[PDB]
Structure formats: C-alpha cells, structure tokens
Amino acid sequence: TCPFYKKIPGTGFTVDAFQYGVVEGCTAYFLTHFHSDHYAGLSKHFTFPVYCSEITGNLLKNKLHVQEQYIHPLPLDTECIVNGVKVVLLDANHCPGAVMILFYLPNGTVILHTGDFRADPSMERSLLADQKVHMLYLDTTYCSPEYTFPSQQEVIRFAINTAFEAVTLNPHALVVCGTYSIGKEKVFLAIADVLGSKVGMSQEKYKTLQCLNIPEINSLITTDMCSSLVHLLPMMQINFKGLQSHLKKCGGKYNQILAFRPTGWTHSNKFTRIADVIPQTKGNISIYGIPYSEHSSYLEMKRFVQWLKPQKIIPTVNVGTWKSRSTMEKYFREWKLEAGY
Numbered sequence: 001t002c003p004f005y006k007k008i009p010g011t012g013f014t015v016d017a018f019q020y021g022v023v024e025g026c027t028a029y030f031l032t033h034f035h036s037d038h039y040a041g042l043s044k045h046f047t048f049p050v051y052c053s054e055i056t057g058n059l060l061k062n063k064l065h066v067q068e069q070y071i072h073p074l075p076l077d078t079e080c081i082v083n084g085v086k087v088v089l090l091d092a093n094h095c096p097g098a099v100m101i102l103f104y105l106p107n108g109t110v111i112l113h114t115g116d117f118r119a120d121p122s123m124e125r126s127l128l129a130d131q132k133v134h135m136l137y138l139d140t141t142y143c144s145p146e147y148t149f150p151s152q153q154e155v156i157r158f159a160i161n162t163a164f165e166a167v168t169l170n171p172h173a174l175v176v177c178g179t180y181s182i183g184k185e186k187v188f189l190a191i192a193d194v195l196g197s198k199v200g201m202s203q204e205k206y207k208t209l210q211c212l213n214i215p216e217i218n219s220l221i222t223t224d225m226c227s228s229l230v231h232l233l234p235m236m237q238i239n240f241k242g243l244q245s246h247l248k249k250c251g252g253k254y255n256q257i258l259a260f261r262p263t264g265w266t267h268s269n270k271f272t273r274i275a276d277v278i279p280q281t282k283g284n285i286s287i288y289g290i291p292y293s294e295h296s297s298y299l300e301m302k303r304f305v306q307w308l309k310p311q312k313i314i315p316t317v318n319v320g321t322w323k324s325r326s327t328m329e330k331y332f333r334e335w336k337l338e339a340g341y
C-alpha cells in the first residue's frame with residue numbers, strides 16, 4: 001500500500017504514487033517530474049486526474065500516451081486551486097519540468113514537498129520566503145557529509161574547454177555524450193555550442209527533447225547523425241567496446257572519439273578537484289567521468305533546511321532501511337541544534 005510519505009495530510013492528494021493501483025481516498029495524483037521511479041505504473045491505461053508542470057504534461061501525453069483528458073498542467077510560480085486547496089509549483093532545479101509543490105492546508109498548516117531537487121540559494125528568494133513552512137518532504141538522496149561535488153557551472157566549463165581543445169587538435173574527432181533519461185541536457189548542448197554543431201541522436205531521444213520547451217531547439221538538435229559532430233548514445237554504450245563499434249558505424253567520417261559519462265557521485269569526489277580530472281584511454285578513444293549532479297550535495301541540503309527551519313522533516317529517499325532512517329534523523333537533529341529552531 002501507498003506509504004505515508006507520499007500522502008499529503010488533510011487532503012485526498014498523493015505525490016509520485018502511481019505504482020499501488022487505486023489509492024483509497026485519492027482525488028488528485030501529483031507527479032513532480034518525468035523520471036521512471038516517480039512515474040512507475042502510469043500508462044495509457046490510467047483514468048484519474050494527474051497534476052504536473054506543462055513540460056511533464058507534454059511527456060506524459062507523447063511518450064507514455066496518457067490520454068489528454070486526465071492531464072492537468074499548471075504554470076509555475078502561480079497560486080492555483082486544486083479540488084478546493086491552494087497550491088503553488090516551484091522550479092526544483094533538477095531535470096526539465098521538475099517541480100517542488102507548496103500545499104496550503106485549510107487548517108493553516110503549510111507543507112513543502114521538494115520532489116527531487118538541487119537546493120540553491122535562489123530558492124531563498126521565491127514564494128517560500130513569504131510564510132512559515134511547518135512540514136518538509138525532503139529529497140534525502142545525498143544526506144551524508146561525504147557527498148560533495150562541484151557546481152554545475154565548473155563542470156560545464158571543464159567539458160567545454162576539453163572538447164574544444166580535442167576537436168581543434170583533430171578536426172576528425174567525434175564527441176559522444178552518454179544519457180539514460182531526461183536531465184543533464186546542458187552537458188551536450190554546451191559542448192555543441194562551442195563546436196558550432198547540432199547534437200545528433202536517435203528518433204526516440206529527439207522526440208523526448210522536442211517536448212521540453214527549450215528555446216530554438218530546432219536549431220540545436222537533429223536525427224541526421226552524419227551531419228553533426230556531437231552524438232548522444234545510451235549510457236550503457238559508453239565504454240571502449242561500444243564506442244569502437246559506433247565509430248565503425250559512422251562510415252570513416254571520424255577517426256577518434258572523446259566521450260563523456262555524466263554520473264552522480266562516485267568515491268573519487270573525496271580528493272580530486274574538477275581541474276585535476278584525467279580520462280581513461282585505449283588507443284583512439286578517451287572517456288571522461290564528470291560528476292554533473294541534479295541533486296543537492298550535503299552542504300546545499302543543510303543550508304536550505306537551516307534557512308527554512310521546518311517544524312518536521314519527512315524523508316522521501318533512502319527510507320527503506322532502519323539504519324538509513326536513523327542516520328538521517330541524527331543529521332536533522334544536529335542541524336536544528338546548530339541553528340536554534
């Protein structure tokens with residue numbers, strides 16, 4: 001059955017709760033963003049109201065084939081009424097169309113659900129600053145002090161300079177960027193822009209990108225692989241074997257590959273700065289691991305929560321084991337004692 005952390009008290013609302021069949025009591029199903037763990041169970045066969053951003057709605061319609069009558073897109077940063085309750089959707093700084101939701105309960109309680117997010121100081125001057133938040137449903141993906149990473153901008157700058165140098169040294173090199181879902185689009189779009197190229201990709205991936213309300217998208221992406229010097233491939237193909245194979249497929253138009261695997265955290269975050277990063281190399285193919293994160297680091301999460309000062313925290317990630325929950329509760333108490341709430 002639907003866990004308590006996906007229910008919003010004093011409403012018949014749920015969030016990211018599509019895998020449990022019909023939820024008893026539920027009159028409106030919110031979807032924070034289009035990642036398969038969160039949407040799991042939604043399909044053309046779902047017949048209840050789904051509330052979401054416009055971008056998430058485009059994806060639901062076109063990729064999952066959910067019928068249009070059941071999709072209720074809402075604009076950002078706007079007070080809206082859903083089934084008699086005031087809500088606001090905010091940018092989560094995660095992947096395209098990802099939202100946090102603010103719920104104003106009839107009794108006067110205020111609840112923030114972060115969905116998946118990457119906490120940032122610009123969220124300190126949104127509609128959140130205007131009133132007290134009593135309860136916080138928190139993306140606790142990286143809630144442990146070992147999880148540090150550079151800013152998105154440091155990582156993009158590194159990627160840009162690396163790619164520009166390699167292709168100026170060898171104008172017959174191909175750049176490849178690995179991908180599995182939506183998110184991290186800036187990696188491949190910034191590389192292409194410094195090289196004066198469009199990004200080439202499969203038909204399914206192109207269809208996905210065409211839903212995302214990215215300005216000038218038609219000038220940036222194509223399905224003609226031939227005509228482009230940055231290609232997207234599935235993450236699973238980003239290895240020496242898959243990359244040599246792809247290079248045979250392109251018809252001797254390129255004689256070298258430089259490939260980027262955007263990952264989350266891995267253990268080498270604990271020593272190496274972004275400037276020290278060096279690739280793995282086998283012959284005429286080089287692979288760079290770059291920690292481009294769309295989740296809060298420990299320090300970013302801590303700052304956001306210390307600012308917000310919620311009366312209660314409800315974790316939404318890593319809640320499946322008692323050890324993880326116990327560990328997280330310890331960090332929440334520390335933050336509360338340091339900050340005086």
Ligand code: NI
Binds near residue numbers: 033094116
């Ligand atoms: Ni996500």
